[PDB]
mmCIF file of all heavy atoms in Angstrom:
data_model
loop_
_atom_site.group_PDB
_atom_site.id
_atom_site.type_symbol
_atom_site.label_atom_id
_atom_site.label_comp_id
_atom_site.label_asym_id
_atom_site.label_seq_id
_atom_site.Cartn_x
_atom_site.Cartn_y
_atom_site.Cartn_z
ATOM 1 N N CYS C 105 29.637 20.340 25.364
ATOM 2 C CA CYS C 105 28.511 20.047 26.249
ATOM 3 C C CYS C 105 27.169 19.930 25.566
ATOM 4 O O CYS C 105 26.750 20.852 24.877
ATOM 5 C CB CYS C 105 28.450 21.072 27.377
ATOM 6 S SG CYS C 105 27.189 20.721 28.627
ATOM 7 N N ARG C 107 24.346 20.144 27.168
ATOM 8 C CA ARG C 107 23.400 21.058 27.809
ATOM 9 C C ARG C 107 23.448 22.360 27.080
ATOM 10 O O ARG C 107 24.517 22.942 26.912
ATOM 11 C CB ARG C 107 23.690 21.297 29.288
ATOM 12 C CG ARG C 107 22.605 22.154 29.939
ATOM 13 C CD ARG C 107 23.098 22.894 31.164
ATOM 14 N NE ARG C 107 23.548 21.973 32.209
ATOM 15 C CZ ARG C 107 23.053 21.936 33.444
ATOM 16 N NH1 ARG C 107 22.105 22.787 33.812
ATOM 17 N NH2 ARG C 107 23.523 21.062 34.327
ATOM 18 N N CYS C 110 25.074 25.692 28.409
ATOM 19 C CA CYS C 110 26.513 25.714 28.599
ATOM 20 C C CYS C 110 27.265 26.508 27.523
ATOM 21 O O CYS C 110 28.487 26.415 27.451
ATOM 22 C CB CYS C 110 27.066 24.309 28.762
ATOM 23 S SG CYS C 110 26.657 23.566 30.355
ATOM 24 N N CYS C 133 31.777 18.503 31.777
ATOM 25 C CA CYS C 133 31.718 19.887 31.341
ATOM 26 C C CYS C 133 32.072 20.748 32.523
ATOM 27 O O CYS C 133 31.393 20.700 33.543
ATOM 28 C CB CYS C 133 30.352 20.252 30.779
ATOM 29 S SG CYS C 133 30.147 22.020 30.436
ATOM 30 N N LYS C 135 31.840 24.074 32.860
ATOM 31 C CA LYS C 135 30.902 25.178 33.106
ATOM 32 C C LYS C 135 29.756 24.744 34.022
ATOM 33 O O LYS C 135 29.606 25.317 35.098
ATOM 34 C CB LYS C 135 30.401 25.831 31.792
ATOM 35 C CG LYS C 135 29.677 27.181 31.975
ATOM 36 C CD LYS C 135 29.990 28.214 30.856
ATOM 37 C CE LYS C 135 29.044 29.404 30.848
ATOM 38 N NZ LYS C 135 29.725 30.673 30.465
ATOM 39 N N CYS C 136 28.991 23.703 33.644
ATOM 40 C CA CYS C 136 27.910 23.200 34.501
ATOM 41 C C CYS C 136 28.424 22.384 35.694
ATOM 42 O O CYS C 136 27.702 22.231 36.682
ATOM 43 C CB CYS C 136 26.906 22.393 33.686
ATOM 44 S SG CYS C 136 27.648 21.041 32.742
ATOM 45 N N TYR C 140 28.437 13.856 31.479
ATOM 46 C CA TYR C 140 27.535 13.369 30.438
ATOM 47 C C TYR C 140 28.115 12.169 29.660
ATOM 48 O O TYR C 140 29.262 11.793 29.858
ATOM 49 C CB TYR C 140 27.192 14.511 29.450
ATOM 50 C CG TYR C 140 26.784 15.835 30.064
ATOM 51 C CD1 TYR C 140 27.692 16.881 30.174
ATOM 52 C CD2 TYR C 140 25.465 16.086 30.413
ATOM 53 C CE1 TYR C 140 27.314 18.117 30.686
ATOM 54 C CE2 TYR C 140 25.077 17.316 30.933
ATOM 55 C CZ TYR C 140 26.005 18.332 31.064
ATOM 56 O OH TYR C 140 25.633 19.555 31.570
HETATM 57 ZN ZN1 ZN E 404 28.032 21.977 30.821
#
Side-chain angles (χ1 to χ4, degrees):
Chain C
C105 186
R107 185 204 299 238
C110 287
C133 172
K135 193 142 166 145
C136 55
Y140 313 100

